[model samples]
Target chain A: IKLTPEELRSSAQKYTAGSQQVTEVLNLLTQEQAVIDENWDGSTFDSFEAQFNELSPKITEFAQLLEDINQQLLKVADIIEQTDADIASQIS
Target chain B: SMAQIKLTPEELRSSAQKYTAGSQQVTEVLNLLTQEQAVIDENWDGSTFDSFEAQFNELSPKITEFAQLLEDINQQLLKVADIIEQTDADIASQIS
Candidate 1:
């Protein structure tokens, strides 16, 4: 069951929009300020935060990959549709 | 576990943002997969569509729950930020 070109475009674009929402959430952190006089130590949070920082960008990159894939998949879907039409015409 | 970094607003914000980002990725995955499933369902035959539907039906609500959880985390972060600001202002006023 192959996807149509329209489906591919719509799906990938939706993913891109979702990924940008994440970037918005992360960017909001830039405006946040910490009270310098306080201290609460937790290594687990620190580690996870660091990892998360590392991963967010990668997700953004993956969004681009999805877009590229969508373009190619749309092309493939077009080819399949055309071929399917040709075969149907001959059979009928 | 260093005491030097506990409850830092920056760390809290970082945590909040990270979870939000993770949730966003999961949401995208879910959205893309669900759309793909729709296409497959339209084109598929027999047991293939049935199996796919069963699998996606199981996973969809869980992903939806996760997106909601991310929203909850976002709300919690805002509350935490407010608390820190209010408490900090109270303490500063006392110092003067």
Candidate 2:
């Protein structure tokens, strides 16, 4: 199915909203990771643990958000495909 | 801007190889995305929620795969950038 202009706009809106949220979260994580990189000390295990603790959850959350976005994009794709199919059938 | 530095044939070939590899990987990701979209469209079971889930499952890998390919391309570009920078330095040294 192919997406009509309206459908495309609506789908883009949904994805954009989710993408904005995800980007905010990712930016926060990136900043935190930079701190961890800058502050790493070879002498202590706690530093490593602290860095991991600060970073791991964000990574997990980012992955989850990516999955969510991928799913939404897929739906958009499906709609577009169906639209294309309908157009093709009509032409044929 | 400094005069444009022309690459030797061998250097151009090497860069092209990396570019082609990066392009091939990107094409694969696009193909995967297209196939997954086709599946979702052809077999949507009416529930919007389910349809989204099915598509997400299929698409996540393609996204991740493409991201990795991008990283590869960045590395290749960095190498080329370093070479260009050194070439600039050499020209400057010759002029001085």
Candidate 3:
């Protein structure tokens, strides 16, 4: 089994970037919720509020999940690189 | 409380548009991750990666569902905008 540490790390970087982007989107979502709540004055808004409450936590969870995935990618890259280094040293 | 309805339909429409944009970003990021997974598969080897891959497989569907829910919320917001506009018109007509 061949391992490319660089490619693994590159993917890891994407996860890191994606997580940040998701976090920004979450912030925008919150701002939108506030704008809608402030301008809306009807019972219908309660349903929208409920939905926003449900989605807020899930978005937060997803962002954290992205970060976790990034960490795992980095860990995998490190493990492969370390293993390769050890083997190369053993042969030297 | 004499039916205080201070809803700006345009604001609701703007919020709906924003939600749509946000949902699009979520989908875009998810798609990017899907593509990167292929890269990961190509470059990664061993049982460790297999275990991680299994975890990713399980989480993928949940993320997909969340994205769809986001889109649903956007649509609902758009509908609410229409309802608000019509309700305001009715209220305006009654106040001779």
The chain A TM-scores for the candidates, taken one by one, are: 0.50, 0.51, 0.82
The sequence of per-residue lDDT tens digits that candidate 2 reaches over residues A1-92 is 34454554444454444444434433543453344334433433244335435544543444455457555655676677787799999999
lDDT of 1 by residue, A39-88 (tens): 43444335334544554455455444444445555565677678878988
Instruction: Please count the clashing residue pairs in each candidate, in the order shown.
Output: 2, 9, 0
For model 2, residues B1-96, the per-residue Cα lDDT tens digits are: 112324433443454354345445434434554454455466544656564556456655544544354345345445655676777678899886
lDDT of candidate 3 over B1-96, digit per residue (tens):
114435466765776777788788888998998887767677555565665566667666666766676677789767866887787799899988
Tell me each candidate's TM-score: 0.50, 0.29, 0.72
Runs in model 2 with CA error above 4 Å? Answer: A1-43, B1-96
Per-model lDDT: 0.56, 0.49, 0.73
Against the true structure, whose DockQ is highest?
3
The candidate scoring highest on lDDT is 3
Go through the candidates in order and give each one's DockQ: 0.20, 0.04, 0.44
Q: What 10-residue stretch in candidate 2 chain B is worst by lDDT? A: B1-10
Off by over 4 Å in 3: A78-92, B1-5, B82-96
